[PDB]
Design a protein around this ligand. Structure first.
Ligand SMILES: Oc1cc(O)c2c(c1)O[C@H](c1ccc(O)c(O)c1)[C@H](O)C2
Ligand SMILES: Oc1cc(O)c2c(c1)O[C@H](c1ccc(O)c(O)c1)[C@H](O)C2
Ligand code: NA
Length: 156
């Protein structure tokens, strides 16, 4: 089954600037997010199909997460990626897709439109705990990118 959820988050940063920084999330997030230690490309060049290995630290234990780049839509400020393996993927789940799209905020800032698609195996339903962790991670990244941009204004 596929379970779909929608959410919104705002930023002072304008969408073109925030999107360009999002494209560099692999190099940004290990720096700003304490739990994230590294992001390595295992397959592809960074485009759709590209597989990344994230090394994370949680409760003093090292764990890995696998992401697949689903789509990149520069024209629409859209970045889509799925969790396809590791600790962030419950056994019931086939995969979890995170869709981000930026649109202009009323005051020159940004609205981040988040879509979460949780793909279950069979008639399994999503784990709520895993879900809370996801949606959080949906923000915690957005904030990382935004904080980086605000802290390094020349960069973008
Ligand atoms: O607050 C967090 C905590 C995390 O463990 C993670 C967060 C944010 O975002 C990371 C992240 C998310 C998306 C990326 O494209 C990426 O390179 C890194 C990852 O989901 C792991
Ligand atoms: O398109 C996919 C879908 C998956 O479920 C996976 C994909 C790619 O690749 C992962 C993967 C994991 C480690 C690798 O070195 C590698 O090249 C690919 C894993 O097999 C799980
Ligand atoms: Na870190």
């Amino acid at each position: 089954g596929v379970f779909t959820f929608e959410d919104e988050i705002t930023s002072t940063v304008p969408p073109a600037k925030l999107y360009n920084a999002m494209k560099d999330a692999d190099s940004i997030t290990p720096k700003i997010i304490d739990d994230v230690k590294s992001v390595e490309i295992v397959e592809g060049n960074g485009g759709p199909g590209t597989i990344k290995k994230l090394t994370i630290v949680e409760d003093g234990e090292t764990k890995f997460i696998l992401h697949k780049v689903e789509s990149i839509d520069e024209a629409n400020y859209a970045y889509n990626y799925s969790v396809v393996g590791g600790v962030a993927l419950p056994p019931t789940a086939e995969k979890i897709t995170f869709e981000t799209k930026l649109v202009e905020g009323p005051n020159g800032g940004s609205i981040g439109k988040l879509t979460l698609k949780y793909h279950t195996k069979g008639d399994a339903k999503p784990d709520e705990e895993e879900l809370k962790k996801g949606k959080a991670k949906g923000e915690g990244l957005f904030r990382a990118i935004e904080g980086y941009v605000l802290a390094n204004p020349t960069q973008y």
